[PDB]
Each structure stands twice: as structure tokens, then as C-alpha cells.
Amino acid sequence: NLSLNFGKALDECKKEMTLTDAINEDFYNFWKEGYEIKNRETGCAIMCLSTKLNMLDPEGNLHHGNAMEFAKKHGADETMAQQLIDIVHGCEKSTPANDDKCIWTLGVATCFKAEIHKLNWAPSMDVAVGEILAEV
């Protein structure tokens, strides 16, 4: 469980987007089964971690719009990775518009989590999170 490291990145995000401590546990639990988190700062956390990919991948394969090698190393080939990517894009289209980008992003991640659940293969949280963070 949890091959990507978000610890330091989350810390930096809390100071840069002036976020309370609630995000140190909320970012993680956001992804657990049957958990619906409706807090904006979880949105902000996601948006801000998609800006620090270079700190999350211990092997340095996680980059924006360019994550196939990371995917591969986390149980998913290219067609599998690509389907996660298409769900992020379809989610970025279907989520209602919003000037608060933290809120919109929480929307997208919310929509993403529900769609990837419908996949007959079961993505690790690492490759699921990695892929949305890489397309956001």
C-alpha cells in the first residue's frame, strides 16, 4: 500500500495554498472505498500535488501527460493506462464548471474515482492516483 510518497509534497502544498492540517489524512482517505469527502482543501491538495510529480515517484517516471513507464511498473500496460487517462479527460469535461479550481478538481477526482471503479481490472491506488495527478 502507498509506493508513491506524498509526505513532503503535501507539507509544501499546506504552506503554499494555506491549507489547514485536515489534508494530511483527507488526501489519503479520499481514495478509500465508500468514502465521499466533500472538502475543498482536498481539491486543493490534489491540484497542488499534480504540480509536484517530481517529488512523488521514487523512480522518477511520473511526469505530466507522460506516465506510461510509471504505469507499466505499477501493474498497468499502455492500453490499461490509457483507459485511466481517458476517464480523467472525460471527467474534466463532465464536471461542472467552477472558478474555484480546488472545487472543480475535487469534482474531477470524485468522478474519476467512481469511473475507474467500473473497470473490470482493479487499478492500484498508486497507478490511479498517479494517472489523475498526471493528467490534472
Side-chain angles (χ1 to χ4, degrees):
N1 201 51
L2 222 266
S3 180
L4 291 166
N5 301 306
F6 311 87
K8 192 175 185 144
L10 272 185
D11 254 51
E12 300 175 354
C13 287
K14 290 148 76 15
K15 306 168 193 266
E16 290 176 25
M17 316 197 140
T18 64
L19 300 178
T20 66
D21 303 333
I23 62 75
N24 290 321
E25 208 183 323
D26 292 8
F27 168 71
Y28 292 105
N29 297 313
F30 173 87
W31 305 101
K32 298 188 74 171
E33 283 285 68
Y35 278 57
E36 245 253 13
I37 300 178
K38 292 166 65 196
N39 303 330
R40 301 176 192 206
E41 299 186 317
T42 288
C44 287
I46 307 286
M47 163 176 87
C48 175
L49 301 171
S50 63
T51 282
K52 314 181 172 273
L53 296 182
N54 45 49
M55 310 183 55
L56 301 180
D57 49 353
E59 188 66 310
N61 297 136
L62 187 64
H63 311 302
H64 188 281
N66 200 301
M68 293 296 180
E69 245 320 304
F70 158 87
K72 189 183 177 180
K73 289 175 192 176
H74 287 77
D77 62 28
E78 292 205 347
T79 295
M80 285 153 105
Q82 189 58 45
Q83 297 336 293
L84 286 167
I85 283 171
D86 284 359
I87 288 179
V88 186
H89 294 164
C91 277
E92 293 180 309
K93 300 324 193 73
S94 62
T95 295
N98 205 314
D99 297 275
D100 196 329
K101 196 184 181 33
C102 291
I103 295 185
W104 182 78
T105 306
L106 185 64
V108 177
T110 289
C111 162
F112 170 75
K113 185 186 167 183
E115 294 302 297
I116 75 173
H117 192 277
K118 294 165 107 292
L119 295 170
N120 190 271
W121 66 279
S124 63
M125 289 181 282
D126 284 327
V127 73
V129 186
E131 288 298 353
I132 184 175
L133 294 168
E135 290 297 343
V136 158

